[PDB]
Amino acid sequence: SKETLLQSYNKRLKDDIKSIMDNFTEIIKTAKIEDETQVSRATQGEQDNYEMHVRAANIVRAGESLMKLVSDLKQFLILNDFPSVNEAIDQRNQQLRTLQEECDRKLITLRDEISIDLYELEEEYYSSSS
Amino acid sequence: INMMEYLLQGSVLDHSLESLIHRLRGLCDNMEPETFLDHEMVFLLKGQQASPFVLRARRSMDRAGAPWHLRYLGQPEMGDKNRHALVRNCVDIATSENLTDFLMEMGFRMDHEFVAKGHLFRKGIMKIMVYKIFRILVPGNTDSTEALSLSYLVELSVVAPAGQDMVSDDMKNFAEQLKPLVHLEKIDPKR
Amino acid sequence: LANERLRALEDIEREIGAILQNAGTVILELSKEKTNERLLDRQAAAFTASVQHVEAELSAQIRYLTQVATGQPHEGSSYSSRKDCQMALKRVDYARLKLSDVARTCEQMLEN
Questions:
Q1: Option in C19, C69, C77 nearest A59 (CB)
Q2: Are B30 and C70 within 8 A, CB to CB?
Q3: Nearest CB neighbour to B26, from listed C66, C67, C74
Q4: Is B189 a member of any domain?
Q5: Which positions form S-S bridges (chain B)?
Q6: From B44's CA, which of A24, A55, B107, B157 has a CA 20 to 30 Å away?
């Protein structure tokens, strides 16, 4: 339903913000240097490098998901935000009415001028001697 | 035959009103709103019975040449046939403009006047009226008036034949399409 | 119409700004010497302010969308006015073609 879709959007937003914050905080925490005990410097360093790269990838993925959320929200607004549909419909209607009225005024003035010319031509043609 | 009126009623605070109207312009038929302005006055006949007869008379002040309107509303049916709407018996009568004078001869006396100013939409058979009730003081004058409350009233009404089910369910669905903005419900006329 | 949509465009740009502020903060932390630790604090506050107001804008817009959603397909339209405008324009075009024909017969008469 509409409620269900809006809830789902809320869930996605909360999840994305939470993920960006958590990944950044975890990267900062690993960035701490600590004294080693039973971790074998080389292994500890490679594991830390992998963790940082994976977390950065996760942050980028969360940003892409936030872009997807913004796109979905834009689609919902363009499709069913009733006020803006009403202002678009009304503006379209008023513009088309003004164009119709301009066309009809042009046609009516054309008819009157053509009618006066027709009167002159009728007098000339019917009163021709031949 | 005897036609019945199905009513759902509610109210809406005025500062949210426009959103309601915009919502209604989506859901109701492809029309501009109507902006009715009516004068309503209630006559009663103090007969022998404990219940005096009641009659409602409306003159549409805004539109010239609109016929006056009489309405008799029967007492609501206690039967649970349509459980979700006020089901009443309605007799609605278009009339000439000497009506009040005629009703003064019939034994009827006035009770109260009120202006009602608002908008009017429809959806199929349904009639949505969103109006503000204006108390008249200085009882002859129609200009000396004061708003009764801050809220507008919203009525969803269907006049149709006696019985005739699957009507109140459609009114339920159309009320539920408004349910964040308005709460429409069958409110009993008692208290 | 341009208002809420431009808000969505701004939130797009600020998501980019959030990612760039994350990247700039770890850029400054990766430096051998990072003297501008005050600027590190400024970039950190910039990052958190970006994330917070992105959350604020999107939460506000989901709330506003919750207020004006109906699940119904909006039975309004603007078709009839477009139809009448098209008929008016085709009336004008018909009159133009006929005036061309009358002017052509007048040129044939005056031409001799």
A1: C19
A2: no
A3: C74
A4: no
A5: none
A6: B157
